[PDB]
Amino acid sequence: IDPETSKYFSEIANLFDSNEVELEERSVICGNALEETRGREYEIATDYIISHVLQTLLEGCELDQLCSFIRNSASVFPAIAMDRSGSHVAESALKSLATHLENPDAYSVIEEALHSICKVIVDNPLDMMCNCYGSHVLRRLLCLCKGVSLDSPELYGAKSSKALAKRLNLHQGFPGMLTYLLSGLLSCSREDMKYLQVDQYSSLVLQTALRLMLKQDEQLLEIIPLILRCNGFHIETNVAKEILESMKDNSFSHLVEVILEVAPESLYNEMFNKVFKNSLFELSVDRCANFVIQALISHARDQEQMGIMWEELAPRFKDLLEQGKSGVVASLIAVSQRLQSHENKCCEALVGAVCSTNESRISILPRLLFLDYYFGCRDKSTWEWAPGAKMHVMGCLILQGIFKFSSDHIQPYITSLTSMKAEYITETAKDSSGARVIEAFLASDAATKQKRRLIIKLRGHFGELSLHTSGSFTVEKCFDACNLTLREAIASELLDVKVDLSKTKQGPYLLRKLDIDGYASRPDQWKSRQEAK
RNA sequence: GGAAUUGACGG
């Protein structure tokens, strides 16, 4: 790259920093600057400095000039896409195309641009899929072909609180282009495919494509056998063995997670019987495979599978908790309630797992609230609490699922929570995971007198709870579950902290929802409007 | 206006 080229693209850069150029002129200058890339797309897109300017250009130009860049650069796009700087240039071009998805006049121009990209990729895909930079480009490209434009963690595919809450049960796009690109990424030998399964970056690409094909059963039934190398759907014994042995690999385990999530019923049933049945517990103790088990459990379809999973895993609930595999337990509990099978057996197995003697069953709640401290401590027969400590996220999610059961199945849990001394209860409410347990109990079908007993034990702390951003929710839910007598006590306690409360983010909504000002000025009128509630 | 598993990701 000669100095006139660098000086030119730098000077274009400085010209945009000096915001003396309206958007109208700006998008013209962007398109004109793209012409200075013709014949040297690779050199400029991979330049560690000028790549950043070229990103600015692709995101600020108009659809016609963007499409010309994608067409002119297409024979070198795979090289650009696999470069540490060029990959962000390639991704800028896709993000820019994606801004036009909502425009129906743009459909055929975009499709043509994707076609020239997909054609060069499909011609030689395997190194691009496995390249650390190129894998990100493919992920975005697959998303664009599907018509999604907004990056989502799950699609790329990170963990997210929304997916956990789903796992724990708490635009048309360019379809022919998606199918054509994906078929190109899959038309390799069974022996190549065996190693795509275990390469981090290719696994990530296939995870995205699988997720994008959710509920496209005719396609999923074509692509999943290719990924699993078992080309009616049937897994032969030798292939099932190879799948089972690769299940502890970190890359393949993530891929099988997604496969279980999108698998149509007949495909799921075959994987259940031919791969996982009889190995559930061994896979549940592996640091990678247990998450595959977590996904298997979540998408179980019928009570017969629920029986098989309960036999292999419930006797080992204590082992799973000790070895840091509470997610497996959480999933089994959660799906029993979804399938309406083995509900009582699951709750009773969890109690027995945490409380071996009969004496210790009154402590089921504190021990699940601090799952890791209790199973970690030197002497478990004296562990009572973990003062000051952050409570255990998955133990609290377990409890949140527990309280969605009918009260018939969870009497040990209700008794244990409603028995905790006042200081422990308010400690739970001040904890951002523990408050979700309390709110789950308040929403459960446990008796009102039992709810009222726990709420009464929070008296004297509603002011401080209201100051917590998480605890303030608990205050409303306590309030809504109360008689007039306790609605007034709570309202009175938010009164003493009204100045501080109104500062905080939630305060204004809390004060309004509870009508705290009306209580302070017209207490009789406040009381009579609540007794009507 | 709220915590988000124990195992991956970029000039």
Q: Write the DSSP string, A70-87.
A: HHHTGGGHHHHHTSTTHH
The whole-angstrom separation of Cα A484 and Cα A495 is 16
Residue nearest to nucleotide B6 (CA to C1'): A324
Q: Are A91 and A137 in contact (CB under 8 A)?
A: yes
For chain B, which bases have at least one atom within 7 A of a protein Cβ?
A: 1-11
Q: Are A145 and A184 in contact (CB under 8 A)?
A: no
The whole-angstrom separation of Cα A56 and Cα A51 is 9
Q: Answer yes or no: is A160 CB < 7 A from strand B.
A: yes
Is there a domain that residue A38 lies in? Answer: yes
The residues, ordered by sequence, that sit 6+ positions from A129 with a Cβ below 8 Å of its Cβ are A135, A138, A185, A196, A199, A201, A202, A205
Q: What is the largest CA-CA distance in chain A?
A: 83
- DSSP 8-state secondary structure symbol assigned to residue A392: P
Is there a domain that residue A503 lies in? Answer: yes
| Domain end (from A152, A169, A196) | A152
Q: Answer yes or no: is A56 CB < 7 A from strand B.
A: no
Q: Answer yes or no: is A291 CB < 7 A from strand B.
A: yes
Residue nearest to nucleotide B4 (CA to C1'): A161
| Domain end (from A304, A320, A354) | A354
Instruction: State the residue for tokens 């709810």.
Output: A451
Residue A515 token pair: 């009508």
The residues, ordered by sequence, that sit 6+ positions from A139 with a Cβ below 8 Å of its Cβ are A155, A156, A204, A205, A208
Instruction: State the residue for tokens 């038309």.
Output: A187
Is there a domain that residue A120 lies in? Answer: yes
Cα–Cα distance list, A477 to A251, A320, A435 (Å): 43, 33, 10
What is the residue type of A365? L
What is the residue type of A194? K
Q: Answer yes or no: is A204 CB < 7 A from strand B.
A: yes
Q: Are A331 and A168 in contact (CB under 8 A)?
A: yes
A81 and A107 in a single domain? The answer is yes
Task: State the alpha helices, DSSP H only, in A237-325.
Answer: 237-245, 250-262, 265-271, 280-284, 289-298, 303-313, 317-322
| Of residues A249, A294, A250, A300, the one with CA closest to residue A271 | A300
Q: Are A148 and A94 in contact (CB under 8 A)?
A: no
Domain that holds residue A382: 364-444
Q: Answer yes or no: is A435 CB < 7 A from strand B.
A: yes
Q: Answer yes or no: is A509 CB < 7 A from strand B.
A: yes
Q: Answer yes or no: is A136 CB < 7 A from strand B.
A: yes
Is there a domain that residue A449 lies in? Answer: no
What is the residue type of A487? R
Instruction: State the residue for tokens 């129906």.
Output: A104
The whole-angstrom separation of Cα A204 and Cα A347 is 36
Q: How many CB atoms lie within 10 A of CB A2?
A: 7
A321 and A341 in a single domain? The answer is yes
The whole-angstrom separation of Cα A484 and Cα A532 is 10
C-alpha gyration radius of chain A: 29
The residues of A between 299 and 358 with beta carbon within 7 Å of nucleic strand B are: 324-328, 330
A376 and A502 in a single domain? The answer is no
A248 CA → B6 C1’, Å:
14
Look at residue A287 and give its three-state secondary structure.
coil
Q: Are A191 and A161 in contact (CB under 8 A)?
A: no
A344 and A213 in a single domain? The answer is no
A411 and A526 in a single domain? The answer is no
| Of residues A186, A191, A243, the one with CA closest to residue A210 | A186
A347 and A374 in a single domain? The answer is no
A375 and A432 in a single domain? The answer is yes
The whole-angstrom separation of Cα A132 and Cα A120 is 19
| Of residues A463, A462, A460, A466, the one with CA closest to residue A504 | A466
Q: Are A106 and A100 in contact (CB under 8 A)?
A: yes
Cα–Cα distance list, A203 to A127, A187, A257 (Å): 13, 15, 11
A147 and A38 in a single domain? The answer is yes
The residues, ordered by sequence, that sit 6+ positions from A375 with a Cβ below 8 Å of its Cβ are A321, A322
Q: How many CB atoms lie within 10 A of CB A165?
A: 12
Name the nt closest to A51 by C-alpha to C1'.
B11
Q: Are A267 and A213 in contact (CB under 8 A)?
A: no
A25 and A136 in a single domain? The answer is yes
Residue nearest to nucleotide B10 (CA to C1'): A133
Is there a domain that residue A157 lies in? Answer: no
The whole-angstrom separation of Cα A156 and Cα A41 is 27
Instruction: Say what the resolution is, in angstroms.
Output: 2.5
| Domain end (from A99, A127, A152) | A152
Q: Are A502 and A511 in contact (CB under 8 A)?
A: yes
A131 and A43 in a single domain? The answer is yes
The whole-angstrom separation of Cα A313 and Cα A279 is 10
Is there a domain that residue A162 lies in? Answer: no
Cα distance between the two ends of chain A:
75
Is there a domain that residue A233 lies in? Answer: yes
Q: Answer yes or no: is A135 CB < 7 A from strand B.
A: yes
Backbone angles phi, psi at A452, to 5 degrees: -60, -35
A147 and A43 in a single domain? The answer is yes
| Of residues A431, A483, A493, the one with CA closest to residue A459 | A493
Structural domain count of chain A: 5
A469 CA → B3 C1’, Å:
11
Q: Are A491 and A519 in contact (CB under 8 A)?
A: yes
The whole-angstrom separation of Cα A319 and Cα A323 is 6
A248 and A371 in a single domain? The answer is no
The residues of A between 92 and 131 with beta carbon within 7 Å of nucleic strand B are: none
Q: Answer yes or no: is A87 CB < 7 A from strand B.
A: yes
Is there a domain that residue A437 lies in? Answer: yes
Cα–Cα distance list, A416 to A351, A401, A412 (Å): 11, 16, 6
